[PDB]
Paper text:
Various attempts were made to improve the crystal quality, and the successful trial was to employ a truncated VipD lacking C-terminal 46 residues and to dehydrate resulting crystals with 30% glycerol at −20°C. The structure of this truncated version of VipD, referred to as VipD(1-575), was determined at 2.9 Å resolution. VipD(1-575) folds into two domains which are roughly discernable: the N- and C-terminal domains, designated as VipD(1-316) and VipD(316-575), respectively. The two domains interact with each other mostly through secondary structural elements. In particular, the two residues of cPLA2 (Ser228 and Asp549), which form the catalytic dyad, are closely superposable on Ser73 and Asp288 in VipD. Moreover, the Gly196-Gly-Gly-Phe-Arg200 sequence, which forms the oxyanion hole in cPLA2, is also present in VipD as a Gly42-Gly-Gly-Ala-Lys46 sequence at spatially the same location. Likewise, a similar groove covered by loop β10-α14 is present in VipD.
In this study, we determined the three-dimensional structure of L. pneumophila effector protein VipD, whose function in macrophage was unknown. VipD contains an N-terminal lipase domain which shares sequence homology with patatin, a phospholipase in potato tuber having phospholipase A and lysophospholipase A activities. We show that the C-terminal domain of VipD tightly binds to the GTP-bound form of Rab5 and Rab22, blocks their interactions with three downstream effector molecules, and inhibits endocytic trafficking in mouse macrophages.
Residue numbers in the entry:
A (entry chain A), B (entry chain A): -1 to 558
């Protein structure tokens, strides 16, 4: 990860990041997996946050959560995000999301038929308190360095909260206590009166700013520090996006920038949708609203796209399943290969036809790429919600669960021959790869050839752009020679790799190669003679899924 | 330490703090020392910060610095404060303060005959960078948890700074490199151009706030975390007070509230005196100026007055030495005892006179008290400075050194008998005391009697306020009985303790006792008879220094 400040230098000196993970299977193969996921971004969308439950379950089962360091979100995303961040556990997170009387979450204390937002913010505080209190007690006896000052502040805040709730006759020791509280409206009113009594800010003698009475973003840091090493991961670094109505742009609140901001206050603001709530208002007097109504979620600063999962839920069924989108493309790819093959009589000998363009397939992934975008169809669950249809809910949930699983699966790819893996990744992204031990040997032997090949690919492009095609064939034959002799690849493997290389050159040249090939074949047809170009083209149209598969059969027999 | 948020509860439940430190000497005595000093507050005053050098030397020799967790300051104080905070070492801190061409620190880039402030802020950045870079390299090889993200950000900032300075042909590896830089004006101009090129803020795609390119208050946290335990104390938690000209009140910037604030920018602002600099301006567009021109320094939030040293320098010689102020009072105290004794013929038998009041000595410390206020006379060194008189400088320095030493000495007191110590401290502040091991036995035996005595003191007051003096004598005799029999104190010790008790009762009763005594003596004189009141009064006027001394002779022979 690189901070935007590093871009201010005249001569940047790229640091080493990790975007890939090459490993060697017990099977003896090589697998290209994405790097461990560090950040999670939950896009806004209103009450479609019931789905996030499914998405979390997926990450849970797959053990992806534990290695998260950052969590950012807006609207429903923001809440979910904060519950994750505050180190709550799935069991309870699940119990919360599905169990909160969001219907009674919308106070009437508002005006003009809109909630004031104070109640929602109050339930959040009760939650953060309850969960942070449990962690606070997970700390050991010592408590030495400035960890004595932090421990005190937290202990005191939790103290303040309880004194206020006790007097109110409210007692919360766990998730259920909270959920039950939301069901009683008389109790909810006691909550508001109780917690609303706590001031927004506290200034001192000379009007200096004092510690926020409420649990803040910064307290998450205070808590993380105090905890034992093996438990520090439980608490995440939370970012909350919001729309600053006054400045009319989004504003992000986080533990590293606005550590003195109330967790509950920010999350409530992030969900202060203009349709359901009256705008919020910060200390500066600027008006705040739902973080998802003006623009999309900004990325987490210190991380790389490759390390961050972005979940974005939307109403209706605008999006299509991932697996059914893969097989739809795969089928089209195979269809195109067939189209090229079945057209050989007209293409080479004679007939009335005209070839299409790889441009009707330029939506082909020629290099390894990680897609970290999780799209979820929420169905009939839109921003405005009053319908907890036992169905529409269970559908949106598992619908979100499946999506996380699908995208999570599209990450790992497995190749048979290390040269293949490396050629797909590209010598470029090879340096930003986290290579394994058992792999290092063959990988670097293979990268040597990969470089020799790359140089040739590059040269072909270079020479064509200068309008010199005299050596295109020769260079191509050379690349094949390297794959056969130097790399020693089976006939099938070689065929697949060479196919890939041909494709990558076409890409790098922006179809300048394919045009040449087609022209050569065409002239050859006119001369009533064969052409070396035909073989290369048949390889160009090979189906990419095959090129990457471990089929062990030629493109022709690839079914799927 | 208690946060002001804990004051919001209906029923506060006082936490245990530490304001005292009872220990047992090898001599076999008991000493009442102040608690370890946690915070240091350096009041504003303009360029009188040359004196702070002396004050630091004192703390250094006395090992008081190492246990500091917080450092707060304004104006000259702010700079000094930040250099301390950034873990710099005395040797260099000394070399810096005295060696900076503050004369050439005041750029001409300003307007209306005032510095713009950009240069001063630039030298500060060069300093923070240089010192933080050294610490950054003190970190070990591992760097594991989110300590990888921090380490990166710092490494990058330092990187940015150097790239800018290198291009400028500037190289700083130590304090001297910096000092020398300040001597060349052509070099200083290169610095400004170089560092001024770095933007104030950096916003992203959607206008989200991004990491400050400059070293921030928050980076101090980043650095502290990264360092090895035994070295975490090197880096202090910095607060910087400033005057917000626009809002016309002071504003405090700190690592826990405004972690994203530039250290250099804040310190420069804190010293942006209206006479020498044009006002500063923050992101909100509010105007900023010297933190010491509008009001005094506010206290560090989580700490107790008892744990914080406050240094406040002022021009001229308004203040008087501490030792010469003690002996001046001591002499007056002894003089008063003499006045009471030499007046006994008139007081008891007959003569024309009229007694003064303990109110001419109510400036007498009846209970143990810690004075943490260090006052320094800066002499002819005022806010506006152009006079680095080799003298006036050395005078202000050592003048500040002596003061820290004096006040630092007035802290420890040593008593012979544990009951004495406890009676001076007061059963009240006894609970907030950090008692030692070897002491616990006798202390709690002694506190039992102390309580019995307190109850009696209290009772005397209680009964007098209800206009009942019938048992004043009896109660007093009882207290003496407890000191003689129960505590078993030498005649001298007993006399001293009883004196103290009599005084404390007078205080608690607001001279209601002394009035009674005097009246009793007066009536007794009229009846031509002696009075028990005379003894008590002679004890009331005993000199407090004696009462607390280990003289081992009666008040009469106390010289000093």
């Amino acid at each position: 990860g690189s901070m935007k400040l590093a871009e201010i230098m005249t001569k940047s000196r790229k640091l080493k990041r990790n975007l890939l993970e090459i490993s060697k299977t017990e099977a003896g193969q090589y697998s290209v997996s994405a790097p461990e996921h560090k950040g999670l971004v939950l896009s806004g969308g209103g009450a479609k946050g019931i789905s996030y439950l499914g998405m979390i379950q997926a990450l849970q089962e797959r053990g992806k959560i534990k290695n998260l360091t950052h969590v950012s979100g807006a609207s429903a995303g923001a809440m979910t995000a904060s519950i994750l961040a505050v180190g709550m556990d799935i069991k309870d997170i699940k119990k919360l999301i599905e169990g909160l009387d969001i219907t009674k979450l919308l106070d009437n204390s508002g005006v003009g038929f809109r909630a004031r937002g104070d109640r929602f913010r109050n339930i959040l505080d009760v939650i953060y308190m309850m969960q942070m209190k449990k962690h606070l007690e997970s700390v050991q006896q010592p408590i030495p360095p400035e960890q004595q000052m932090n421990y005190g502040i937290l202990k005191q805040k939790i103290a303040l909260y309880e004194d206020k709730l006790s007097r109110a006759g409210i007692v919360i020791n766990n998730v259920d206590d909270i959920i039950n509280l939301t069901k009683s409206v008389k109790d909810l009113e006691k909550l508001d009166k109780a917690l609303n009594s706590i001031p927004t800010e506290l200034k001192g003698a000379k009007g200096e700013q004092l510690e926020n009475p409420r649990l803040t973003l910064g307290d998450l840091g205070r808590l993380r520090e105090l905890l034992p090493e093996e438990n520090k991961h439980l608490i995440k670094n939370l970012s909350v996006v919001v729309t600053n109505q006054t400045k009319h742009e989004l504003e992000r609140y986080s533990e590293d920038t606005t550590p003195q901001q109330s967790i509950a206050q920010v999350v409530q603001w992030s969900g202060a949708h203009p349709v359901l709530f009256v705008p919020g208002r910060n200390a500066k007097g600027e008006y705040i609203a739902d973080g998802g109504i003006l623009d999309n979620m900004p990325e987490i600063e210190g991380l790389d796209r490759e390390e961050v999962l972005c979940v974005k839920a939307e109403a209706g069924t605008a999006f299509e399943d991932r697996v059914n989108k893969a097989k739809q493309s795969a089928m089209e790819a195979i269809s195109w290969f067939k189209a090229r093959m079945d057209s050989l009589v007209e293409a080479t000998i004679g007939g009335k036809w005209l070839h299409a363009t790889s441009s009707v397939l330029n939506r082909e992934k020629v290099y390894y790429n990680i897609d970290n975008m999780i799209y979820i169809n929420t169905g009939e669950v839109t921003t405005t919600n009053t319908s907890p249809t036992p169905e529409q809910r269970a559908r949106a949930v598992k619908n979100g669960y499946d999506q996380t699983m699908q995208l999570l699966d599209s990450h790992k790819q497995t190749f048979d021959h290390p040269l293949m893996a490396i050629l797909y990744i590209g010598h470029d992204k090879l340096k930003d790869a986290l290579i394994d031990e058992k792999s290092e040997k063959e990988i670097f032997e293979a990268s040597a050839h990969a470089q020799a090949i790359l140089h040739l690919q590059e040269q072909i492009v270079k020479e064509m752009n200068d309008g010199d095609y005299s050596s295109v064939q020769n260079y191509l034959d050379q690349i094949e020679d390297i794959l056969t002799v130097d790399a020693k690849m089976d006939d099938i493997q070689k065929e697949k790799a060479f196919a890939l290389c041909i494709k990558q050159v076409n890409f790098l040249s922006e179809g300048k190669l394919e045009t040449y090939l087609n022209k050569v074949e065409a002239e050859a047809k006119a001369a009533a003679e064969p052409s070396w170009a035909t073989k290369i083209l048949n390889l160009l149209w090979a189906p990419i899924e095959w090129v990457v598969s471990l089929f062990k059969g030629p493109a022709q027999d690839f079914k799927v």
